[PDB]
Design a protein around this ligand. Structure first.
Ligand SMILES: CCCCCCCC/C=C\CCCCCCCC(=O)O[C@H](COC(=O)CCCCCCCCCCCCCCC)COP(=O)(O)OC[C@@H](O)CO
Ligand SMILES: CCCCCCCCCCCC(=O)OC[C@H](COP(=O)([O-])O)OC(=O)CCCCCCCCCCC
Ligand SMILES: CC(C)CCC[C@@H](C)[C@H]1CC[C@H]2[C@@H]3CC=C4C[C@@H](O)CC[C@]4(C)[C@H]3CC[C@]12C
Ligand SMILES: CCCCCCCCCCCCCCCC(=O)O
Ligand SMILES: CCCCCCCCCCCCCCCC(=O)O
Ligand SMILES: CCCCCCCCCC
Ligand SMILES: CCCCCCCCCC
Ligand SMILES: [Cl-]
Lengths: 33, 51, 193
């Protein structure tokens, strides 16, 4: 097995960024008076 | 203080609270099954699939 | 304006609950899966180790991963730092599951009070996860981890081994937990209006 972890970390960071962006959109919807 | 609300009021709860103590049966009737269902779900999923 | 206000508050509350469930799933996954740190090209032996469980190769040009470790038996955990990190991540999982249970209180209790209760619970889960992720690298001095990774590995130093998806996912879980905590605080103070 190739012992390189690049795509794995990439997909992990992408999913995390998606979740965090959704939650910052939640802050946006709140703080937009 | 972006709200300018006192932090203890903004975050914590000194307002009201206990008083709502007679309704503990009503709380428990829904609380205990939910806690047990969550425990069973995490337990079985962890032991059967994730490990 | 008031009906739009109520509609937005209800929608954001539902979204907050959904993201809380997602973060609970993330917390369970990072607690269980042993992919926090892993081998590299220059490592003497292959394998990986998580909070308590770890697999290591025999070293005969194959997989042959011998796997050992279990949180239900602290004797098998390599180090006290690993024990502390596993305990703190478990406490965070318990706290977030406690909030998911406390979702039931929305039927009876005041919505602002329930929102503040999960705000504090999620914040405490975030601190527990932060403590676990700071304490977990402390245990890399253990003999088993040194054997797996190399001599260059040490306290607060990766060495030859590399972080894998579970560790960065735990960091993402910290960020999500803190964000959801503040979201719950703002929702609780918004419901009263
Ligand atoms: C695998 C794990 C699955 C997780 C399972 C989680 C399930 C855990 C158990 C029970 C949940 C209870 C939810 C009940 C929410 C009911 C809330 C409701 O009745 O509507 C109003 C709005 O509330 C609110 O905005 C609060 C909204 C609460 C949102 C939480 C429920 C959504 C669950 C959606 C499921 C998504 C699953 C997807 C996962 C992939 C409040 O009423 P009310 O004005 O009359 O009161 C005023 C006061 O004077 C007396 O109550
Ligand atoms: C065996 C299951 C029986 C289910 C019966 C369903 C009846 C639902 C009607 C709504 C509940 C209700 O208003 O009455 C019961 C209590 C409140 O009673 P009261 O004293 O306020 O008048 O309400 C409560 O305070 C708690 C109600 C909880 C209902 C069931 C929760 C799920 C239980 C899971 C079982 C595995
Ligand atoms: C009471 C409610 C709110 C929370 C319940 C938390 C539950 C789900 C927690 C508490 C203790 C946890 C267990 C602690 C230790 C282990 C050993 C590990 O190798 C697999 C997971 C497993 C088996 C955990 C599964 C989840 C667990 C059962
Ligand atoms: C009345 C609500 C009860 C909720 C708790 C239900 C838990 C039931 C568990 C029964 C044993 C499950 C054994 C599963 C074995 C298998 O998955 O192959
Ligand atoms: C077992 C259930 C534990 C219930 C704990 C109290 C929940 C909040 C009680 C009412 C809050 C309020 O509106 O004053
Ligand atoms: C409102 C005061 C509730 C006190 C609960 C005591 C629990 C004791 C557990 C041993
Ligand atoms: C009840 C909290 C979420 C439990 C998630 C279990 C792991 C599912 C992996 C798909
Ligand atoms: Cl275990």
């Amino acid at each position: 097995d190739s012992r390189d972890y690049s795509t794995e970390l990439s997909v992990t960071v992408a999913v995390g960024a998606s979740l965090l962006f959704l939650n910052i959109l939640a802050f946006a919807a709140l703080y937009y008076k | 203080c972006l709200d300018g609300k006192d932090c203890a009021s903004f975050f914590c709860c000194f307002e009201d609270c206990h008083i709502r103590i007679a309704k503990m049966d009503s709380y428990a009737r829904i609380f205990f099954p939910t806690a047990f269902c969550l425990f069973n779900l995490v337990y079985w999923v962890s032991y059967l699939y994730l490990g | 304006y008031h009906e739009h206000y109520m509609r937005n508050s209800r929608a954001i509350g539902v979204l907050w609950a959904i993201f809380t469930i997602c973060f609970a799933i993330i917390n369970v996954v990072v607690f269980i899966q042993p992919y926090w740190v892993g081998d590299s090209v220059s490592t003497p032996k292959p394998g990986y180790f998580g909070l308590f469980h770890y697999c290591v190769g025999s070293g005969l040009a194959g997989r042959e991963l011998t796997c050992r470790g279990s949180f239900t038996d602290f004797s098998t955990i390599p180090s006290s730092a690993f024990k502390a990190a596993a305990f703190f991540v478990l406490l965070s999982m318990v706290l977030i599951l406690g909030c998911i249970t406390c979702f039931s209180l929305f039927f009876f209790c005041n919505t602002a009070t329930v929102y503040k209760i999960c705000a504090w619970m999620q914040l405490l889960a975030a601190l527990c996860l932060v403590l676990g992720c700071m304490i977990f690298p402390d245990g890399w001095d253990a003999e088993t981890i040194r054997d797996m990774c190399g001599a260059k590995t040490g306290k607060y130093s990766l060495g030859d081994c590399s972080v894998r998806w579970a560790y960065i996912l735990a960091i993402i879980g910290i960020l999500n937990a803190l964000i959801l905590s503040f979201l719950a605080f703002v929702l609780g103070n918004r419901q009263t209006d």
